[PDB]
């Protein structure tokens, strides 16, 4: 990347800011901005690129061959019983949460068994998380 | 990427801002902005690219060959009983949540077994998460 | 990367800021800004790149061959019982949370068994986490 910006409230290249309950009198603002931006990004000069894959099997005997890729999720149990018995009782459940396997962002590239790759891979995440807000 | 911006409230290249309950008197604002932007992004000069895949099998004996790709999700159990028994009781369930496997964003590229890839892969995520808000 | 910025509230290249309950009188602001930015990023000059993979099997005997990739998640149990018995009782559950395997951001590149890779891999994360807020 080049420029990544996270700003909580206010972003301003030039800010003449006046807030509340203010007396703004006899003001002379003079501004000159000569701003130049020149970007040359991701320039490639390749005369020749070779990607080569060769597989040869000759009068061979192969048996019981197994190949398994990544993220092999097998025999997984989630068990969340909730047994609530009541007798002459007062429950005030204002904000009660039961969350299981709650994803927000899942991003995947190039999850393989055999990969031959040339170039650029980029991931950017910006956010504001706020799970529970009980006023 | 080049320019990624996250701004909570206000973005302004030039901001002459006046808020409430303000007296703005005798003001002379003079502004000159000579802004130039030049972008040259992702320029490629290839004289020759070869991607080559060759497979040869000759008088061979192959048996019990197994290939499995990624993300192999097998024999998975989710069990969330909720047994609520009641007897002379008062329940006030204002905001009660039971969430299982709640995704927001799932993004996938190039999830394969064999991949030969040239170029650019880019993922950008911007958001504001707010799961529960109970006033 | 080049420029990564995290700002809590306010970002300003030039800020003439006046807050509340202020008397702003007899002001002469004069500003000249000659700003130049020149970026040359990720320039490659390759005359020749070779990526080569060759596999040869000749009159061989192979048996019981097993290859397993990364992230092999097997035989995993989550057990979170919640047994709440009640008798002449008052419960005030204002903000009670039961969270299991709660992800926010999961990012993956190039999770393979065999990888041949040339170039750039970049990951950027910016956020503000706030799990529980009980006023
Ligand atoms: C504002 O400027 C003018 C001219 O410069 C001047 O006559 C005036 O008195 C100023 N304001 C005050 C409140 O003095
Ligand atoms: C910018 O503006 C001011 C305002 O008077 C001027 O004096 C100056 O010569 C200007 N410069 C450029 C580079 O534009
Ligand atoms: C890429 O193109 C030619 C190839 O040799 C080279 O002379 C030139 O300087 C390169 N371009 C840049 C912007 O560097
Ligand atoms: C391996 O081969 C034997 C017999 O040759 C067979 O019983 C077994 O199931 C095989 N295992 C796999 C994983 O293929
Ligand atoms: C505003 O400016 C004019 C001319 O510069 C001036 O006559 C006037 O008095 C100023 N305002 C005040 C409130 O003084
Ligand atoms: C910008 O505007 C000001 C206003 O008077 C002027 O003096 C200056 O010469 C200008 N410059 C350019 C580069 O436009
Ligand atoms: C790509 O085109 C030619 C090929 O050699 C090269 O001379 C030129 O400089 C390159 N373009 C840029 C913008 O670099
Ligand atoms: C492997 O081969 C044996 C017999 O040769 C067979 O019983 C078994 O099911 C095979 N396993 C697989 C995974 O193909
Ligand atoms: C503001 O400036 C003007 C001219 O410079 C002047 O006459 C005036 O008295 C100033 N304001 C005050 C409150 O003195
Ligand atoms: C910037 O502006 C001031 C304002 O008078 C001027 O004196 C100066 O010559 C300017 N310089 C450039 C480089 O623009
Ligand atoms: C890449 O292109 C040619 C190749 O030799 C080289 O002379 C040139 O200086 C390079 N470009 C840059 C911007 O360095
Ligand atoms: C290995 O081979 C034996 C018999 O040759 C078989 O019983 C066993 O299941 C095989 N194991 C695997 C992992 O393939």
Curated annotation (Swiss-Prot), chains A, B, C:
Intrachain S-S bonds: 95-134
Protein location: Late endosome membrane; Lysosome membrane; Cell membrane
Known tissue expression: Expressed in the brain, including in the frontal cortex (at protein level). Expressed in lung epithelial cells.
Mutagenesis / variant outcome for changing residue 94 to A: Decreased number of infected cells by SARS-CoV-2. No effect on infection with HCoV-229E
Ranges per topology, Lumenal: 1-135
Glycan attachment sites: 26, 32, 45, 64
Function: In neurons, involved in the transport of late endosomes/lysosomes. May be involved in dendrite morphogenesis and maintenance by regulating lysosomal trafficking. May act as a molecular brake for retrograde transport of late endosomes/lysosomes, possibly via its interaction with MAP6. In motoneurons, may mediate the axonal transport of lysosomes and axonal sorting at the initial segment.
Quaternary context: Can form homomers. Interacts (via N-terminus) with MAP6 (via C-terminus). Interacts (via C-terminus) with the vacuolar-type ATPase subunit ATP6AP1. Interacts (via N-terminus) with AP2M1 and CLTC. Interacts with TMEM106C.
Family per record: Belongs to the TMEM106 family.
Disease link: Frontotemporal dementia 2: A form of dementia characterized by pathologic finding of frontotemporal lobar degeneration, presenile dementia with behavioral changes, deterioration of cognitive capacities and loss of memory. Gestural apraxia, parkinsonism, visual loss, and visual hallucinations are present in 25 to 40% of patients.
The protein's name in its UniProt record: Transmembrane protein 106B
Protein source organism: Homo sapiens
Lineage of source species: Eukaryota, Metazoa, Chordata, Craniata, Vertebrata
Gene giving rise to this polypeptide: TMEM106B
Span of the entire protein shown here: 120 to 254 of 274
